[PDB]
Every structure is written in C-alpha cells, then in structure tokens.
Amino acid sequence: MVLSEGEWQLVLHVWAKVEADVAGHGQDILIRLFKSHPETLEKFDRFKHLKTEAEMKASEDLKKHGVTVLTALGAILKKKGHHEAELKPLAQSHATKDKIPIKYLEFISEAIIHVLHSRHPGNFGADAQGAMNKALELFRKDIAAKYKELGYQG
Ligand code: HEM
DSSP, X not given: OOSOHHHHHHHHHHXXXXXXTHHHHHHHHHHHHXXXXXXXXXXXXXXXXXXXXXXXXXXXXXHHHHHXXXXXXXXXXXXXXXXXXXXXXXXXXXXXXXXXXXXXXXXXXXXXXXXXXXXXXXXXXXXXXXXXXXXXXXXXXXHHHHHHHTTOOO
C-alpha cells in the first residue's frame, strides 16, 4: 500500500549485495554519516573519542555496531511494509533510551544511498535509487509515528 511489488524487488535485489559483506558496508555507512554530519557522532558515547578515519576503520566496536544497524534494517526491509513488530522496539530505543531526531535518520538514509551508489553502480541506477529512497522514506514516516506515540516529537 506504499511501494509496488516491482519496487520492493529492486530494493531486495540490491540489498542482497549488501549481505555479501555486511561488516564492510556497515563500516562505510557509519563513517560516511560521521564525516558528512559530525554532529551525529556526539550521540554515540562509545565512539566520540574516535578522531580520524583510520581510527574509525580500525575500530572493532564501530564495525560490530555497523552489523547491528544493517541487520536490523534488513529485517525491516524484507517485511515489505509489514514491519510493525520489528519497528516498535527500534522506535523505543531511539526515542527513550537515546533521543535521535528524524533529521538524523534523514542523514543516515543519505549515507546508505551514497554507499550503495559508490559500491554497486551497475545495480543501482535511477529506478533502484528511487525505490530505495521510497523504502527509507516509509521507514522514517512509520518510526516518526511511533516516536510520537511514545511522547517524543522527533
Ligand atoms: C537506519 C537507521 C538505524 C537503525 C536500523 C538503527 C538501529 C540500532 C540498533 C539495532 C541499535 C541497538 C539497540 C537499540 O535498538 O537501541 C541501535 C543503537 C543506537 N543507535 Fe541506532 N539505528 C539507526 C539510526 C541511528 C542514528 C541515525 C543514530 C544517531 C545519530 C543512532 C544512534 C544510536 C545510539 C546512540 C545507539 C546506542 C548504542 C550503544 O551505545 O550501545 N541510530 N541503533
């Protein structure tokens, strides 16, 4: 009732390429986020001490968090819009535990698209970029609704 079947299949086709190397893609995506929007780094008490790109690449903890982030997102994408159960705990941990504005989810969405385009251009042309953009838009709209339900405006 938001993406068409064909759009979902484009999303899952490129996501399969991510799955070939989750740790690498995860690392790349978090570094791209922090490099482009340094203010996001302040939300992470465990990585705030990291001062250069090399130190980031070498950090076991950052790489582990990358896998955690992408595992969770992939589980959501594979639901093709039917992600209520999976989305609710994610909203709670980003709305009460830690307070992550919708703006910053926008920033990490841009980082994901940047990295997919950098690594898989042959499989991420305009139609695929559009489909992925839509799926990340849907993720953001629905987590924003859950944010509000919990008392956080986002
Ligand atoms: C595609 C978007 C994202 C996904 C799928 C995601 C997912 C997760 C997951 C699975 C965890 C671990 C436990 C939990 O659920 O809290 C986590 C933790 C966290 N996330 Fe996110 N996250 C996303 C975006 C962000 C953004 C944009 C920020 C901050 C700029 C952020 C900040 C954090 C923080 C501060 C923690 C706690 C880590 C710790 O200290 O152990 N997340 N995230």
